[PDB]
Design a binder for these strands. Sequence first.
RNA 1: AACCGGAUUAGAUACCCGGGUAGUCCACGCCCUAAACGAUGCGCGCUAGGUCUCUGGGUCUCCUGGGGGCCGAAGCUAACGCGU
RNA 2: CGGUAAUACGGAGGGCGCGAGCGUUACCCGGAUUCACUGGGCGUAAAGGGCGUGUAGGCGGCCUGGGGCGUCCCAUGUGAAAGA
Lengths: 234, 150, 208, 138
Amino acid sequence: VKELLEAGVHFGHERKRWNPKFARYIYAERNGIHIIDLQKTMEELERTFRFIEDLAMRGGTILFVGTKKQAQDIVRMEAERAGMPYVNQRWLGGMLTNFKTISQRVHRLEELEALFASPEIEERPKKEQVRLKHELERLQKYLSGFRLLKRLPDAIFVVDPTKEAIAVREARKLFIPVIALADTDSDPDLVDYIIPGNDDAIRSIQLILSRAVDLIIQARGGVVEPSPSYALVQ
Amino acid sequence: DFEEKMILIRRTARMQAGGRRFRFGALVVVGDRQGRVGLGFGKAPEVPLAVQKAGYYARRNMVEVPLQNGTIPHEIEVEFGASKIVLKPAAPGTGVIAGAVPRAILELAGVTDILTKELGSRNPINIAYATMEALRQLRTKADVERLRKG
Amino acid sequence: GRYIGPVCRLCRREGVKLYLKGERCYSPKCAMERRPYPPGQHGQKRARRPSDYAVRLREKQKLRRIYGISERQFRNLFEEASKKKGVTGSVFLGLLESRLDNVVYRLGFAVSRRQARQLVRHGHITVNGRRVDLPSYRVRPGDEIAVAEKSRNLELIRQNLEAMKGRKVGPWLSLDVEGMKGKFLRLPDREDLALPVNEQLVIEFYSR
Amino acid sequence: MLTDPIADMLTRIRNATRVYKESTDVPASRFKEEILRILAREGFIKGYERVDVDGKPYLRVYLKYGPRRQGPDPRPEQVIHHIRRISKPGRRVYVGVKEIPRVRRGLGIAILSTSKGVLTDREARKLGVGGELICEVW
RNA sequence: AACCGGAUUAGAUACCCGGGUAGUCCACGCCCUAAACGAUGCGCGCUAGGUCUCUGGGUCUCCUGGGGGCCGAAGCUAACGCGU
RNA sequence: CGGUAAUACGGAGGGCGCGAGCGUUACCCGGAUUCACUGGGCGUAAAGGGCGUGUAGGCGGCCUGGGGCGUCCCAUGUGAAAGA
Ligand SMILES: [Mg+2]
Ligand SMILES: [Mg+2]
Ligand SMILES: [Mg+2]
Ligand SMILES: [Mg+2]
Ligand SMILES: [Mg+2]
Ligand SMILES: [Mg+2]
Ligand SMILES: [Mg+2]
Ligand SMILES: [Mg+2]
Ligand SMILES: [Mg+2]
Ligand SMILES: [Mg+2]
Ligand SMILES: [Mg+2]
Ligand SMILES: [Mg+2]
Ligand SMILES: [Mg+2]
Ligand SMILES: [Mg+2]
Ligand SMILES: [Mg+2]
Ligand SMILES: [Mg+2]
Ligand SMILES: [Mg+2]
Ligand SMILES: [Mg+2]
Ligand SMILES: [Mg+2]
Ligand SMILES: [Mg+2]
Ligand SMILES: [Mg+2]
Ligand SMILES: [Mg+2]
Ligand SMILES: [Mg+2]
Ligand SMILES: [Mg+2]
Ligand SMILES: [Mg+2]
Ligand SMILES: [Mg+2]
Ligand SMILES: [Mg+2]
Ligand SMILES: [Mg+2]
Ligand SMILES: [Mg+2]
Ligand SMILES: [Mg+2]
Ligand SMILES: [Mg+2]
Ligand SMILES: [Mg+2]
Ligand SMILES: [Mg+2]
Ligand SMILES: [Mg+2]
Ligand SMILES: [Mg+2]
Ligand SMILES: [Mg+2]
Ligand SMILES: [Mg+2]
Ligand SMILES: [Mg+2]
Ligand SMILES: [Mg+2]
Ligand SMILES: [Mg+2]
Ligand SMILES: [Mg+2]
Ligand SMILES: [Mg+2]
Ligand SMILES: [Mg+2]
Ligand SMILES: [Mg+2]
Ligand SMILES: [Zn+2]
């Protein structure tokens, strides 16, 4: 449960849009691009994974959050690989702070799914049959990963704290730990446990999340075969 | 367990076609008199619904107050906007000498002796906000020691 | 001259039993019995939430009216308490409890406060062998507060000391019931008084 | 020309600590050096050391800060919460031994310049000497 | 400008149209005002950056000065906003 | 406040505050950090002088040494009495 030679994947990103606060993890500027110090990555990785294994084998709940077009279908699988919830299509304002109200939409989703497995789907008129059709369609679109949250998460995992800052801001306010994959354009101070690296470039995203979920299930003694998410590279 | 005192309420009218339509502002202090106080500001269409919100918002956003023999460890000044609040420790047998607003906060905090002066903008809302941040910045000789231990 | 008039009307306005009437504040006639609401036409109307000054004001009256003193002597006693060393709160009470007219009642020589006042004012009270007819006279610890043998045969005196038989006195006082003597041992503490008055409220009334 | 090197040094530290710099340099001076000594003794700075920059002597001041805090604004609590130059040029401040203030009811210091040297408010009072009131630090 | 006319208009002591003197230009001497505005006095030290541009130097994807703009860290501000 | 239900006018009942006093007017300090030493400000609220030059004055980078005027410490004399 580690990696060394990953310089072959994840070197750097974000030519110069850099947040200055990220300077401590920058190695140099090669061909006009910020290259992230590779040793500094693993240093924050160890401090991050130890917290993960601790929270994992404690029984906690980690909200995996990623809306990037790159990280959409990788978050879907690796969070399903674990028992963790995920956010895929869009992060809704109040998913944490308004978690009470956002959860009531899950009750409608469960209600309409339950009423769509019952014989009563055709007992309603044709017009209500297409309306409640559209409800389940969008309610499953956004909440497919958020479905599994019974309480507020014990941890949050994000792949671009810059683009997901609406999600980090809430975890901050609710004092929920923020675990992040953060490249040059991210503010490091907002991340409790940071992994410096490309927020784009799928080749490296699949590696971090898989090794993350690999480390989660290893903490619970459910050792898993390789991740199915490797076929999404090409 | 939890005592709450009402600072003030207001009419806060809003203009619309045909006539004005108003909200209600409500400011409520919450305290246990054991060193824990909270402040909250409610807005609702009817008066009581405003105090309810204030009682809820004040139970969130609490402040641990380090009471030393019923007073503050040290004097501090706090500028919130144009409003400035000043707090100074008092020997017992003095009492809470404060405006209407700071007295309500500090009494529910558990302070029995303190000296207070409001300055600049005497606006109650800002005074309350200022007095709060004043209490968030209190430190103990143990606290300040643990900052310089290294 | 102090306040003179209806008393158990002021039992009502303070909302707390005021034993200035002496007896009959104990018997169920005090008008605190089955009439706790304040006097006047609007006494039975629902009272509005008192202002922060309203509370401080009523608490002072609740204390001042209990000893039966004008505001003049009352205020001066406070300004004396703030200068002396110690807690302004408790020291002020001990100064009130040092009033001769108040000690006379506290010693059970008289039934009420007003009654103990008249006993002093007419010279029936002895302090260390001399007559002292001033109700405002402050008693020092150790002074003997006695009854003039001229009055020891008065039926009003033998009346109150008859019910004082077996009755206990405050821990800062002691009395010989037969010879009609008495002694002020020490200044009472805050705990020594059961007065239903928050003193910090009264101090806070005077910071303004 | 620089006007008040002490306020300049007092500010150079004030400014560096608000953005949480690891270190900052101040033009080297013996009087300044005695100031920094009191701060390193009283635990407001990690310490200091002489250094040259482009040949000219300077003093690296290593700041210290509190623990990284909880939800929003994780920035740590300052070790130096306040620094103010008291006796400036154009209005000098000299206090006798009985005129020395108690800083933040004892939790802070008052750097005094005295005939017996640069002392904190406490050191100056047990020495029984007053002098120029340099600054508050708390 | 003034003023002489023509219109417009309820009226036109104006806007519009035809004229037209001082003046506007030059020299020499006065006058000393202005929204003379960045409505922000001068000098020096300190405090993230990104980008556009004028002008120097440089081992000339760029680095480094000195100006002129725009976003914006921390912070300040009653707010707008200010922000090397 | 009062222009038809006035707790604001005028009286009554009642209530509150002081009580041999209670109100009023004038005057002083206070609240007033509203002349800001403690303890304020001037982009738009009152407030940067139209700009420069430069006199007086105010202010003064780093190292050593003498002096000891400012500054600090001790002793002493003085600081009448009353007051506090
Ligand atoms: Mg931990
Ligand atoms: Mg959305
Ligand atoms: Mg990015
Ligand atoms: Mg605390
Ligand atoms: Mg201000
Ligand atoms: Mg104390
Ligand atoms: Mg004002
Ligand atoms: Mg006093
Ligand atoms: Mg003394
Ligand atoms: Mg006292
Ligand atoms: Mg006292
Ligand atoms: Mg005793
Ligand atoms: Mg007073
Ligand atoms: Mg004409
Ligand atoms: Mg005409
Ligand atoms: Mg017309
Ligand atoms: Mg001029
Ligand atoms: Mg200025
Ligand atoms: Mg060039
Ligand atoms: Mg420039
Ligand atoms: Mg800007
Ligand atoms: Mg900001
Ligand atoms: Mg009528
Ligand atoms: Mg009417
Ligand atoms: Mg009528
Ligand atoms: Mg009336
Ligand atoms: Mg009337
Ligand atoms: Mg009457
Ligand atoms: Mg009298
Ligand atoms: Mg005045
Ligand atoms: Mg003044
Ligand atoms: Mg004042
Ligand atoms: Mg004025
Ligand atoms: Mg000033
Ligand atoms: Mg000063
Ligand atoms: Mg001002
Ligand atoms: Mg102006
Ligand atoms: Mg100008
Ligand atoms: Mg001007
Ligand atoms: Mg010098
Ligand atoms: Mg000079
Ligand atoms: Mg000398
Ligand atoms: Mg004298
Ligand atoms: Mg004397
Ligand atoms: Zn009674």
